[PDB]
Amino acid sequence: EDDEFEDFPTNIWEENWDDVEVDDDFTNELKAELDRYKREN
Amino acid sequence: KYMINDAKTIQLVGPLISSPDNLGFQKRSHKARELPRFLINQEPQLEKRAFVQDPWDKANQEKMISLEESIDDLNELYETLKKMRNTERSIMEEKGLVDKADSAKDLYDAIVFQGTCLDMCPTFERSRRNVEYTVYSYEKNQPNDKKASRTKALKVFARPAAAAAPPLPSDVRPPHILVKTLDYIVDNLLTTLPESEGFLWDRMRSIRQDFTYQNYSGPEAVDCNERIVRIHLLILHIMVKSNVEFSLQQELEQLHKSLITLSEIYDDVRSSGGTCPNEAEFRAYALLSKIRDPQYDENIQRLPKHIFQDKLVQMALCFRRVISNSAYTERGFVKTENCLNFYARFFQLMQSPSLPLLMGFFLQMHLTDIRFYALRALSHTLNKKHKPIPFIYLENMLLFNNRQEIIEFCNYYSIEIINGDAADLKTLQHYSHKLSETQPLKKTYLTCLERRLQKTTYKGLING
Amino acid sequence: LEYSDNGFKDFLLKPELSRAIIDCGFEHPSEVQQHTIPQSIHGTDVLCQAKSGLGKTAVFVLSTLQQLXPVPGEVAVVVICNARELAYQIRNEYLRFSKYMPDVKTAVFYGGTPISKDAELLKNKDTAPHIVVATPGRLKALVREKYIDLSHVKNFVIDECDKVLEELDMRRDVQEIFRATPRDKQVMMFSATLSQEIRPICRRFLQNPLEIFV
């Protein structure tokens, strides 16, 4: 619907998200790229 | 005029409540009252309008032309035309083709103005400048000719003056002549640049004024304003390349003023179900006119998909992002978070052959600013003991045309120069591209664009 | 190698006012016009100084007309000037923009004019002017004779305030005339030159102004 309000008759943010590490395909591919570069040199 | 009364519209809008009969109302014929004063909308003309002139009006214009040919004394001609104008003005007022400058109309029967100036410049106007000696050499048929030639003259932008009688239809010229006049400028006057920058700028400003008098916004008005903007862009590059002193501010003000006027016409055509074939290109220039103004980013978002997805607009948006720098300091400017400041990407775009040439001319006005913040930003990521940056690296980065250009840039911002080939960026002190005491540095250009311009004629570029 | 941290369509004017602007071709705002017109429509008092020939007169005329609420039996705004010829210019300026507002009536007054005639047209409902521009001498006489009801004054416009305020007698007159007008109103003045000495005198009767000096 439209953004206008209708009529009227607790933390929610991930404070520590950079601290916790969660694996995913992209990071594992990225880590593979760094490993390849280090072995080359 | 009254409120409209159509069965379809009444049925389309629908009844005020569910059932008037239950409430006790009875159907009753009601007079068609006048529409409320806030409801009146004066739709500007959007289609071609047939050109018509009174037989006396055209006969009068023919008669004064013969007098101009026959009479040789300039003062005699000007006085006679002035008397003829006074008699002509009274006839038009009684005829009803011009306001009396004191009437009180209701805006519902306001006179739709219709210019009748068949030639390039009004005959009386040409005579007046003959005695003022304000006729440029371009308009004269020969450099020694005393009076301006009709086939080559042009109308001067009449600045608004207090207690000035409203123009007669004989002065303002019809749109289908303005297209012819603009075609005259494009073909036979563009090569005169840059020595005629002030002449063309004044004359083109007059051309847009004639549209304003007629309250016309038809296809000719859109076409004419489109080419006026392109002239300003091309005339913008010529002045800096040729290095001729010129009032840059009045060029940008008129260029921006034309763009909002041109953009405003686009909205009306869209609101009326029409279309303008070259809307995408001139939306792009509007974005570039104020690079660091967020108001222009929201306007481009409300536009339809086909406009927003056109490559010209997409190219314009890419530039606005890469210019966006968070460290940009200017009086009365508020910084924004996470600005890219992609100076290196910006110069890669300016060399791209897909960049339309006219946009490139527009962006050259920001070269000094971007280069400054590129060097300012780079300076903050060097330790105190870093070696000076060689000029060869900077020229590759910032696209300086020659070593003489970079040394002037470093010298302007009090950047120390070492061995005549390296810049010591740690000595930069200014955090803003502008210095309060000093005059702004002269605008520069890119050799890639200048070389690209020389491979295409002016008129071929302006028309498109 | 170690780290080391360190165009007047943006204001939504009246359709009658906009069309009158269009028919004159004056569609090129000045620098003072660019800054003040968005501020003028808000109603904030402005003490702006601008050079001659920049269309300073039209700046407030648009502002007055945009804020003008036309009531047949009262005068809306009052413009005060010292020069008779300049006053006639202001009326002519008003006439051009009032082209499509027939309900608006405007008249001018000056010293040496039959005061009875000026009161006569004011008394008539048909010739009652919503806008009046007058010399300080004539306006003071009209006010002191209770000929003009100033309770409905909304905007107070002064042209060349420094020149008028420089003369102490006319400084007395404008102060006296200002008393007949309600405090809750907009006061705006303009002049080609505005020195620092006249600013506190201008600021004496001004509250929260916008000062622009050349």
């Binding site: 943010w13 591919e29 | 600005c339 791209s352 | 109603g43």
Partner: protein
């Protein structure tokens, strides 16, 4: 003499029958229209003037005449034909309310609020047919905003007077009008003058409902001017209040999901992910998945993913004036995470404090992927034209200036050196602390 009874009631401040909603006023009007038919306008004026108990104020009398004139000529079968009467009465009603000493102003205020919400519904309904009515788009609403703007300017602080009780009511109404007519920059005047006019000691003394809506529109206004931090503090404060109200109304929930549509991306720009626990009732399950994909791309530094996601969600983002802001602000956060990932696996774990540009270029090649200059894409789009893996130097330098990275770069040596520390916190500071420090926002509490 039924009309005379109404005038006696009207002149005594009882405005029970003074309303434009025929659903609760139709019977009275039909009797009135039956009696008042065939009357000249001057007769109506003389009818009001001679009527006793009528206040001497001209503006109040005009409003009564306009209502009587409205009742005479109302045609319920066609709202369009009746538009002129309705809008003329409403403008005269508000005009009667301008003077702070107008008679019966205390009882007049509830009527004006009641009528205003009626006209806005009518004006929106009419403006949907601007083509068939030969009127410019958004003309009825634009007229009302001017009507209320005069009323809003008439509010001046001097017990709570009637006007001050609805000061925030006008501001929410005016701003919603300005946003709907697609002229949000007009709201700037409203916000600047809102605080000086209010006589309340503190902003929180207004009703909680009108506080939340004001913050939502204010934060929405800030986001248009690309000031995300000022926008975020308003959105976050507004949503915190909304969690206090009970959720059983089911109209709060639709309002809660409206603010989240802006709070979530604005919070993301400042590097703040949001738990999906508390937000489960407000957001649909599909919307959770849509934002989760964006979070996954931007958390782990995948520029191509962010660009692809923006391309997929272009239209609805562009509707909310979000595409340009997200496309410009998000990439810098994405780079920070990308550089954080490589540094953590290169400096902190392999003991190398020097980052060659060639290494970073290989990383950027994998993240950004195909670009405009690459043979894959010919035309330049806003998605594939801005980011290129060749500008390794420019990416690092703009991170250091923003404070998101603490390193020194050596253009001549083609490498950037960074502090040698086991803990990565020293090298790459937390995102939200740095951005907030560099761009302090106005306090959430207004006054």
């Amino acid at each position: 003499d039924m009309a005379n009874q109404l005038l006696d009631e009207l002149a005594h401040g009882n405005f029970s029958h003074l309303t434009l909603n025929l659903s609760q006023n139709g019977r009275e009007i039909a009797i009135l229209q039956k009696q008042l038919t065939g009357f000249d306008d001057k007769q109506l004026e003389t009818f009001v003037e001679q009527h006793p108990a009528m206040p001497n104020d001209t503006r109040f009398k005009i409003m009564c005449t306009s209502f009587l004139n409205y009742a005479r000529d109302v045609d319920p079968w066609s709202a369009w034909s009746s538009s002129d009467l309705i809008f003329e009465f409403y403008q005269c009603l508000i005009n009667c309310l301008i003077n702070d000493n107008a008679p019966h102003i205390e009882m007049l205020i509830p009527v004006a609020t009641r009528e205003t919400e009626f006209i806005i519904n009518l004006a929106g309904k009419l403006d949907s047919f601007h083509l068939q009515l030969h009127t410019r788009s958004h003309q009825f609403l634009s007229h009302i905003s001017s009507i209320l703007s005069r009323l809003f300017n008439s509010i001046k602080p001097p017990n709570i007077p009637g006007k001050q009780r609805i000061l925030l009511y006008l501001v929410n109404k005016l701003n919603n009008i300005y946003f709907r007519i697609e002229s949000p920059q007009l709201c700037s005047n409203i916000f600047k003058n809102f605080q000086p006019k209010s006589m309340l000691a503190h902003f929180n003394e207004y009703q909680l409902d009108q506080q939340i809506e004001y913050r939502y529109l204010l934060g929405r206004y800030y986001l248009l001017n690309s000031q995300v931090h000022n926008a975020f503090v308003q959105f976050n404060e507004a949503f915190q209040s909304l969690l206090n109200l009970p959720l059983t109304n089911q109209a709060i929930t639709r309002n809660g999901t409206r603010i989240l549509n802006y709070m979530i991306p604005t919070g993301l720009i400042l590097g703040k992910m949001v738990k999906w626990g508390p937000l489960r009732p407000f957001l649909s399950q599909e919307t959770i998945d849509n934002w989760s994909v964006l979070y996954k791309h931007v958390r782990y530094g995948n520029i191509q993913g962010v660009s692809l996601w923006l391309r997929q969600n272009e239209r609805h983002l562009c509707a909310r004036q979000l595409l340009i802001v997200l496309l410009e602000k998000l990439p810098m956060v994405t780079y920070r995470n990308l550089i954080k990932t490589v540094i953590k696996s290169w400096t902190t774990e392999w003991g190398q404090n020097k980052l060659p540009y060639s290494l970073i270029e290989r990383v950027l090649q994998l993240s950004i992927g195909p670009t405009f200059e690459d043979p894959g894409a010919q035309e330049i789009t806003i998605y594939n034209g801005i980011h290129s893996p060749k500008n390794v130097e420019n990416v690092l330098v703009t991170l250091i200036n923003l404070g998101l990275l603490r390193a020194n770069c050596f253009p001549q040596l083609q490498l950037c050196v960074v502090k040698k520390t086991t803990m990565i916190q020293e090298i790459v500071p937390p995102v939200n602390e740095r951005i907030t420090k560099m761009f302090p926002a106005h306090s959430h509490v207004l006054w």
